[PDB]
Write an enzyme that holds these catalytic residues in place. Structure first.
Site, PDB file in Angstrom:
ATOM      1  CD  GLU A  39       2.491 -12.286  -5.304  1.00  0.00           C
ATOM      2  OE1 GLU A  39       2.903 -12.761  -4.219  1.00  0.00           O
ATOM      3  OE2 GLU A  39       2.936 -12.639  -6.419  1.00  0.00           O
ATOM      4  CG  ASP A  48      -5.403   1.886  -0.519  1.00  0.00           C
ATOM      5  OD1 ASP A  48      -4.569   2.623  -1.091  1.00  0.00           O
ATOM      6  OD2 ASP A  48      -5.221   0.665  -0.335  1.00  0.00           O
TER       7      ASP A  48
END
Ligand SMILES: CC(C)Nc1cc(Nc2ncncc2F)ncc1C(=O)NC[C@@H](F)C(C)(C)O
Length: 286
Positions: free
Chosen positions: A31, A143
């Site tokens: 997560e 990223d």
């Protein structure tokens, strides 16, 4: 080329998005959106359920991931199997990675054994091959980080998370990325493949040291600060080599550090391009 799933079929895949960790028999894997384990027939999958950046921005990130995955297939890139866009829910379905992320394997999360130096070199080479494929196909990742470098059962490195990817120096008003990995120019809004190189240099430091780029319970909190201590000759890279390895040799370690230092050049035009990074990493193991 991708299977369109209904959000309801993905509920039947992820045992209704069960939030217990996979380490105790659940479906949650990670997560920050949440990633869930599932089965589509006998195929193990990773289902990323996106979570709220504006709705249209998250939707643009979802569409961008699909667009880049439709055009880019390579052994060092994750493979998208399908997606779900029905309603206000957005899911991306991938081939499951048995060894999860490089970030998690460097920290030995869930009791996995430390990665050997030999395996770390192969992972660095695989990741560089993936970035090279993206740059050859005029895509800037934006990223690059060890959480976005996944590992299959054979520890083959697979670049993930193409939501911020851009077609290829330009500017943006919405600065996005992970600050501990970002090049100074990326932090001030510039969009360039030279920034992916800098972020890859931070990944190389994480591989050498076993330290995450940022750790709130560490002094210094940023791994780039440790690099500053070595540049200012206050310390050496030998003082920071991950102690969880028994097969690191100073020659090979120094060679990877030299690649990382070049990637982290102050001025973007002094950084090597990805083809040069691949060459230097291949020479390191030659
Ligand atoms: C969310 C990250 C940290 N973890 C995964 C991600 C994953 N695949 C992908 N997840 C997200 N995007 C693309 C993908 F390919 N497959 C799998 C994982 C995952 O946890 N595997 C299990 C291993 F880590 C194990 C068994 C050592 O715990």
């Amino acid at each position: 080329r991708f299977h369109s799933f209904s959000f309801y079929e993905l509920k039947n895949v992820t045992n209704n998005f069960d939030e217990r960790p996979i380490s105790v028999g659940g479906n949650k894997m990670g997560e920050g959106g949440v990633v869930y384990k599932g089965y589509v027939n006998n195929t193990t999958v990773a289902v990323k359920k996106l979570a709220a950046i504006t709705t249209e921005e998250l939707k643009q990130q979802f569409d961008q991931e699909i667009k880049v995955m439709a055009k880019c297939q390579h052994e060092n890139l994750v493979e998208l199997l399908g997606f779900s866009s029905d309603g206000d829910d957005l899911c991306l379905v991938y081939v499951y990675m048995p060894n999860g992320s490089l970030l998690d394997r460097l920290s030995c999360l869930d009791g996995t054994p430390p990665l050997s130096w030999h395996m770390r070199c192969k992972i660095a080479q695989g990741a560089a091959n993936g970035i090279n494929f993206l740059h050859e196909n005029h895509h800037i990742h934006r990223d690059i980080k060890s959480a976005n470098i996944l590992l299959d059962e054979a520890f083959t490195a697979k670049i993930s998370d193409f939501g911020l990817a851009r077609a290829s120096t330009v500017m943006t008003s919405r600065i996005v990325g992970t600050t501990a990995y970002m090049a100074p120019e990326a932090l001030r809004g510039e969009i360039t493949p030279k920034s992916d190189i800098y972020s890859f240099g931070v990944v190389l430091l994480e591989i050498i040291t076993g330290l995450p780029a940022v750790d709130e319970h560490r002094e210094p909190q940023l791994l780039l600060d440790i690099k500053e201590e070595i540049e200012d000759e206050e310390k050496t890279i030998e003082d920071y080599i991950d102690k969880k390895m028994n097969d690191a040799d100073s020659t090979s370690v120094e060679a990877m550090y030299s690649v990382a230092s070049q990637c982290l050049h102050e001025k973007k035009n002094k950084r090597p391009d990805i083809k040069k990074v691949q060459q230097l990493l291949q020479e390191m193991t030659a």
